[PDB]
């Protein structure tokens, strides 16, 4: 069909550019994500809120296929030093995304183009690192794909219904109560350790990072999609309640709702696979020591006890 053929053309046009891109290093993308909120923290937080809302307008079946496609492509990418997928897996990632975007609310989706801060300076840097004639040809093929997708769009008509707690519920409230005082002292619009990790982590061990991403997607595919939708919406609500507060500190009720929603979503994952993510990413132990070093020692240790308690309640459910 129209999408399939346009996607094919887009894939053809972009694969050669993709082959020259530094997927695993500290590219202009790694540095842009790392510093994006430094400029306008509120705009960055609102953008994330819009990103999740758009995701909430999509057809879960197509979201799932799109994620499956990335996981399958990682299987081939994570074996070579360039983290470069096969032309086959690559073309399949694009067609799955084209179909998933066809199910999204059109206006909300198109609005993501201008939602993130300074995405224009990033795009200019990405172009400067590509062959200009090549990227131009790719962009014209991208436009033709967007039209095929727009023409085929169901405009969010399959958005999932979203709702809007025995031992789990109780253990989550204690966890919330013990972590809120730690959360409320941090500046979520300026988190030095996390930014530095995002900026430099992959470059140090690209293969392990691609594997970590892959395992994470893999774990996500074992979760109950309605629970995924609930947790995602819980965060959309939290952010709205956090946007005007210094440091983007969540409101107490929103924060609790997020932890409960996550607890439930994690209860639905493959346990060994979820558990294993703890050691899946490169440099995570060192990242956690640095995050811990920024917190009140006492309160964090006290919180860890509630964290272990919640982990058990969830395992029993």
Ligand X SMILES: CCCCCCCCCCCCCCCCCC(=O)OC[C@H](CO[C@@H]1O[C@H](CO[C@H]2O[C@H](CO)[C@H](O)[C@H](O)[C@H]2O)[C@H](O)[C@H](O)[C@H]1O)OC(=O)CCCCCCCCCCCCCCCCC
18 is a contact residue toward ligand X (CB under 6 A): yes
* 98, two tokens: 């084209």
Are 228 and 220 within 8 A, CB to CB? yes
Say whether 214 counts as a known binding-site residue. Answer: yes
182 is a contact residue toward ligand X (CB under 6 A): yes
* 35, two tokens: 């510093």
Number of residues that bind ligand CLA (CB under 6 A): 29
* Of 71 and 202, CB closest to Mg ion: 71
The conformational region for residue 86 under phi > 0 = left, psi -120 to 50 = alpha, else beta, is beta
17 is a contact residue toward ligand X (CB under 6 A): yes
Are 264 and 256 within 8 A, CB to CB? no
23 is a contact residue toward ligand X (CB under 6 A): no
2 is a contact residue toward ligand CLA (CB under 6 A): no
Are 167 and 267 within 8 A, CB to CB? no
Are 28 and 36 within 8 A, CB to CB? no
* 207, two tokens: 């293969």
76 is a contact residue toward ligand CLA (CB under 6 A): no
Q: Could you list the residues that contact Mg ion (CB under 5 A)? A: 71, 74-75, 214
180 is a contact residue toward ligand PID (CB under 6 A): no
d(CA 165, CA 183): 23
* Binders in 196-215 for ligand CLA, by CB under 6 A: 197-198, 213
d(CA 292, CA 284): 12
Interface residue with ligand X among 147, 222, 245, 288 (CB under 6 A) is: 288
* 88, two tokens: 């086959």
Q: Which residue has the tokens 């594997």?
A: 211
* 123, two tokens: 């795009």
Question: Of 153-161, 162-170, 222-230, 282-290, which segment contacts ligand X by CB under 6 A?
Answer: 282-290
* 64, two tokens: 């799932």
* Binders in 16-45 for ligand CLA, by CB under 6 A: 23, 29, 32-33
- Helices 28-39 and 192-204 pack at an angle, to 10 degrees, of 180
Interface residue with ligand CLA among 232, 249, 260, 310 (CB under 6 A) is: 232
* Residue set of the binding site: 71, 75, 214
Note the residues at the interface with ligand CLA (CB under 6 A): 23, 29, 32-33, 48, 52, 66-67, 70, 97, 101, 116, 119, 188, 194, 197-198, 213, 216-217, 231-232, 235, 262, 266, 281, 284, 287, 291
Note the residues at the interface with ligand X (CB under 6 A): 14, 17-18, 21, 51, 112-113, 119, 130, 135, 138-139, 142, 179, 182-183, 213, 216, 277-278, 281, 284-285, 288-289, 295, 300, 303-304, 307
């Amino acid at each position: 069909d129209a999408i399939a053929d346009a996607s094919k053309r887009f894939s053809d046009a972009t694969y050669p550019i993709a082959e020259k891109f530094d997927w695993g290093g500290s590219s202009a993308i790694a540095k842009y994500i790392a510093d994006a909120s430094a400029g306008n923290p509120r705009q960055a937080a609102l953008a994330v809120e819009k990103l999740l809302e758009v995701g909430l307008t999509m057809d879960p079946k197509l979201v799932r296929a799109a994620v499956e496609a990335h996981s399958k492509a990682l299987d081939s990418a994570k074996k070579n030093a360039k983290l470069m997928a096969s032309k086959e897996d690559f073309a399949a990632v694009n067609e799955a995304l084209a179909r998933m975007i066809a199910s999204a609310d059109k206006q909300k989706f198109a609005a993501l183009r201008t939602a993130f801060p300074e995405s224009r300076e990033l795009q200019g840097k990405l172009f400067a690192g590509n062959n200009a004639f090549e990227a131009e040809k790719a962009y014209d093929s991208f436009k033709a794909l967007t039209s095929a997708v727009r023409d085929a769009s169901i405009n969010g008509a399959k958005a999932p219904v979203i709702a809007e707690d025995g031992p789990v519920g109780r253990a989550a409230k204690k966890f919330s109560e013990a972590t809120y005082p730690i959360m409320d002292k941090l500046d979520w619009g300026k988190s030095p350790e996390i930014s530095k990790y995002i900026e430099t982590a992959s470059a140090k061990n690209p293969k392990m990072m691609a594997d970590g991403i892959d395992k994470t997607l893999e774990v996500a595919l074992t979760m109950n999609q309605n629970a995924i939708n609930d947790a995602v919406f819980a965060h959309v609500r939290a952010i709205k309640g956090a946007l005007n507060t210094p440091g983007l500190v969540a409101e107490r009720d929103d924060f609790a709702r997020v932890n409960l929603a996550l607890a439930k979503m994690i209860a639905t994952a493959d346990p060994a696979k979820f558990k294993a993510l703890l050691t899946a990413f490169p440099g995570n132990a060192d990242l956690q020591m640095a995050l811990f070093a920024a917190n009140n020692p006492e309160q964090a240790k006290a919180a860890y006890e509630t964290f272990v308690a919640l982990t058990s309640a969830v395992a029993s459910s």
